[PDB]
From a paper:
We report an in silico strategy for the biocatalytic synthesis of chiral N- and O-heterocycles via Baldwin cyclization modes of hydroxy- and amino-substituted epoxides and oxetanes using the limonene epoxide hydrolase from [name]. We turned to cofactor-independent limonene epoxide hydrolases (LEHs) that normally catalyze direct hydrolysis of epoxides by positioning and activating water at the active site. On the basis of the well-documented mechanism of ReLEH, a water molecular is positioned by H-bonds to N55 and Y53 while D132 abstracts a proton from the water, enabling a smooth nucleophilic attack on one of the substrate’s epoxide carbon center. We have rationally engineered the epoxide hydrolase ReLEH with construction of a general platform for Baldwin cyclization reactivity of hydroxy- and amino-epoxides and oxetanes.
Several hits with essentially eliminated WT hydrolytic activity were identified, including variants SZ532 (Y53L/N55P), SZ534 (Y53V/N55P), SZ609 (Y53I/[name]) and SZ611 ([name]/[name]). Indeed, they enable Baldwin-type cyclization with little formation of undesired 1,2-diols. In the case of the double mutant SZ611 ([name]/[name]), the formation of Baldwin product 2 is improved from 10% (WT) up to 78% (2:3 = 7.8). Compared to WT, the hydrolysis conversion is largely decreased from 99 to 46%. These results suggest that the substitutions [name] and [name] of ReLEH can effectively break the water binding network, thereby endowing Baldwin cyclization reactivity. SZ611 assembles into a homodimer structure with four α-helices and five-strand β-sheets in each monomer, forming a cavity that serves as a deep substrate-binding pocket, in which a substituent of substrate 59 or of product 46 can occur without steric repulsion. Two other essential mutations, [name] and [name], have well-defined electron density maps that together expand the hydrophobic local space, thereby leading to the preference of intramolecular cyclization reactions.
Author numbering:
A (entry chain A): 5 to 149
B (entry chain D): -2 to 11, 17 to 148
Write the structure that this text describes.
Amino acid sequence: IEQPRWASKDSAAGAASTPDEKIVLEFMDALTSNDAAKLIEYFAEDTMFQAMPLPPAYGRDAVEQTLAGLFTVMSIDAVETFHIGSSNGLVYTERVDVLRALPTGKSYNLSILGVFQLTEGKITGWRDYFDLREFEEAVDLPLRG
Amino acid sequence: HHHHTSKIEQPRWAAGAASTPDEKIVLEFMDALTSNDAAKLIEYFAEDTMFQAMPLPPAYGRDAVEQTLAGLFTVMSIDAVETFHIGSSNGLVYTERVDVLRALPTGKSYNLSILGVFQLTEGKITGWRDYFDLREFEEAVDLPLR
Ligand code: NA
Ligand code: NA
């Protein structure tokens, strides 16, 4: 994954600087597993997840099943985190996800800005902001009717 | 928000106050967005800068940024901005926020969920990228933006 033109040249921009940011960076590596059972370990009981163009999932049960539903149709082939920062229990990630659609085989580099809420080392909230139509039309896989 | 026709519901998952000089400048830039004035907003930007509403192509340089913002303000108005979360690290400011956008050709309004990032150098914006879903905005206001 190439560094975008607008990427910060601060050598520490993409590096974790707190234990919370290190956990989020480990979560980004584990995203390539496409394994909701593995990823659910990072989540607290009182938590939520939402790919913002799609309906949110509240509670650990709904988060795992929502992630598992996405992984039946798409694979996260690579995650490249350009920027990671944090303030007040929220961690922010500006990144590219290489998403591959299983039915069509096409892949696409999706620009994503996400936020992670963490208490006691566990994710109590994860929201990824991006444009869904770009990914749908890129890989020929509609996720929103 | 001082825009009584607008209403921003409190999100269930929602901290929003500035804790650094860079966060304060970004928050002041958010209040100035309701001016819908590219000539006034461009004063916050440095010479070497960029802007991109991520579903749309980016603009590099203070000239292209002012022109891109001016073009957007000819078809839409920023009626209100509420920042639920603001944070910063490595000279980058992140803002989780809803913007009430009103499309001028149709008169329809929409509350757009946005996560944005601001890179600041000596108090001036060197980068502003807002992440959001364009389609849901387009369909709610009947205004294709691509
Ligand atoms: Na960093
Ligand atoms: Na911080």
